[PDB]
């Protein structure tokens, strides 16, 4: 009857995309979901305060761009901004 939201199938078929012959425990997906929620809250709060002290009412792509560059260590950061910019460009090229 209740509704509890989860990213279980999301990380499940992400793992089936990268390693299609590997299984995952439900406990392991619980660390996966908690870690994902933690980094989500971190990047969203960083972008929120970065938009707040810039007197801006909107989080565009540039705010979360600079917040990702703030929160992530160097080579992982540059790979992440490259791939996310690729995804953003692919989104705006299509309808």
């Amino acid at each position: 009857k209740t509704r509890k939201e989860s990213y279980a199938i999301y990380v499940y078929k992400v793992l089936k995309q990268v390693h299609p012959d590997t299984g995952i425990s439900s406990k392991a997906m619980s660390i996966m979901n908690s870690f994902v929620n933690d980094v989500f809250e971190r990047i969203a709060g960083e972008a929120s305060r970065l938009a707040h002290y810039n007197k801006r009412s909107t989080i565009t792509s540039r705010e979360i761009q600079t917040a990702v560059r703030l929160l992530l260590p160097g080579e992982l950061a540059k790979h992440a901004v490259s791939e996310g910019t690729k995804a953003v460009t692919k989104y705006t090229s299509a309808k």
């Binding site: 990380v11 972008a47 909107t58 979360i64 080579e75 953003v88």
Partner: protein, 104 residues
């Protein structure tokens, strides 16, 4: 036709944009920000499972135990730097023995 289909991604953007509205981080959210939000967290889950999957073949087990994600972070300096203030439950500590402690 979901927004993740036109982005070509696999994490949903309609979920992420939903908690960007009622999440009170700001009252107005731009269009590309939840798309950019979904894309970054595509990497951060996939960075773990290939490291967990590499350690899965090292132990030769076709299931991922909470041991495996513990060594998927702690053996990498770029991942230990970010995840230094958080413990992982029932994963233990990677084996490390100091050289002066060793005999002979």
């Amino acid at each position: 036709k979901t927004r993740s289909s036109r982005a070509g991604l696999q994490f949903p953007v309609g979920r992420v944009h939903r908690l960007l509205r009622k999440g009170n981080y700001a009252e107005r959210v731009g269009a590309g920000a939840p798309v950019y939000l979904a894309a970054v967290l595509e990497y951060l889950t996939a960075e773990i499972l290939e490291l967990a999957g590499n350690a899965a073949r090292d132990n030769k087990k076709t299931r991922i135990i909470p041991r495996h994600l513990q060594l998927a972070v702690r053996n990498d300096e770029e991942l230990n730097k970010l995840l230094g203030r958080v413990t992982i439950a029932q994963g233990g500590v990677l084996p490390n023995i100091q050289s002066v402690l060793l005999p002979k």
